[PDB]
C-alpha cells in the first residue's frame, strides 16, 4: 500500500530499505560492500541524485520494514512529542502500515 496521509503533513524518509523501486523502474541494489541504485546506513540506499526530465513527484513502492517521518507543513505546530514514525509490518500474511500519532494545529 502507501503510507497513511495525515492532514497538514508531508511524510519523508531518511534511508530506503533495499528493494525500493522508482526503462521500467530504478532499483536499490546492495551487497556487503555497499549499496547503490542501478538501471540509470548499511542495507539502505541514499537518496538518488537528480536526473533531468524529472517528474515533480517521486513515486516509491516500499518493501516490508520501511521507516518514515512526519513533518507538519509550514504554518502548523506539532501538539504531541517526538518525530512520528510509520513502519510496514507483516501481520498474518497481510501487508499494512502502522498508524502515526500526530496532529498539526494552527
Amino acid at each position, epitope marked *: 500500500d502507501d503510507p497513511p496521509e495525515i492532514p497538514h503533513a508531508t511524510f519523508k524518509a531518511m534511508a530506503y530499505k533495499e528493494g525500493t523501486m522508482l526503462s521500467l523502474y530504478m532499483l536499490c541494489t546492495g551487497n556487503s560492500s555497499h549499496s547503490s541504485w542501478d538501471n540509470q546506513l548499511p542495507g539502505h540506499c541514499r537518496e538518488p541524485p537528480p536526473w533531468e526530465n524529472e517528474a515533480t513527484e517521486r513515486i516509491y513502492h516500499f518493501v516490508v520494514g520501511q521507516m518514515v*517521518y512526519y513533518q*507538519c507543513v509550514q504554518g*502548523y*505546530r*506539532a501538539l504531541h*512529542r517526538g518525530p512520528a514514525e510509520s513502519v510496514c509490518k507483516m501481520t498474518h500474511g497481510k501487508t499494512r502500515w502502522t498508524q502515526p500519532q500526530l496532529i498539526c494545529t494552527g
Partner: antibody
Amino acid sequence: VQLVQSGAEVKKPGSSVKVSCKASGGTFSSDAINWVRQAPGQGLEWMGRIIPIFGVADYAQKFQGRVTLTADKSTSTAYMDLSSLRSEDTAVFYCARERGDYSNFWYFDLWGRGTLVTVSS
Amino acid sequence: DIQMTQSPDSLAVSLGERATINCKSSQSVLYSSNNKNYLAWYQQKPGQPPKLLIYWASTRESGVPDRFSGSGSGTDFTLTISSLQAEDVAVYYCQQYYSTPYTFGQGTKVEIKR
C-alpha cells in the same frame, strides 16, 4: 535568522525591568522562545516558554508569579518582565528558539547574546 | 521534574587525552515509539552564549568536530572528548527536553591539567 536582544540595565531594588528579544528573520513561525537565566558563577536555569503562534505560555515552578512573558506578532518580538526585584536577581537572560514542526519538545537551535541586569542601590 | 546530576563537578585531564563526563536522570528518557533518547549536551565557553553540541544523545550536530561523541542510553548517559585540544576548555551541560520544565545540569568545568 538571528535573535537580537536589548542592552544592559542597572536598576534599583523594588523596581521593574523589561527585556526584549527580536528575530532578524521573518517571524516566529510555529516556534517557541525559551528563556534561560544564569546568575554569575552558577549553572543555567530555565524560566519558561512562550509559543507565539499559540498565545500560550508555560512557566517553571520556581519563578511562577514573578515573571510575565509577552510576544508581539506585528514586530515579531518576545518580552520578559520582572516584578519586585530583589538584590539577588543579578544575572544574564538568554533567549532560545526551538523549532516545532517535528515535535513540541525539542532542542535549542539558536541562542541570543544575553541581557545583563544588575540590581543594586 | 526530571533532574540532572553531572559528575564530576570539575574535571582535569592532560592535553590530548581522553575525557569523560556523565549524566543521570531521575526518570527514564528513552521514548518507546521512537527508541530515541531526548538528551542534549551544550558547550558554553566563558562570556558567550551556549552552543548546541550533541542531540538525541548520539547525533553529532553539523560543524562539530568528530572527536566529540555522545553515548549511553536510558539514564546513564555520557560524553567523550577524545584527544582534547586547547579549544575544548569550557563548561558542558546536560538538558532534559523529554518534558517540561526542562532541567539543566550542575555543569562540569573541563580544565586542562599540567
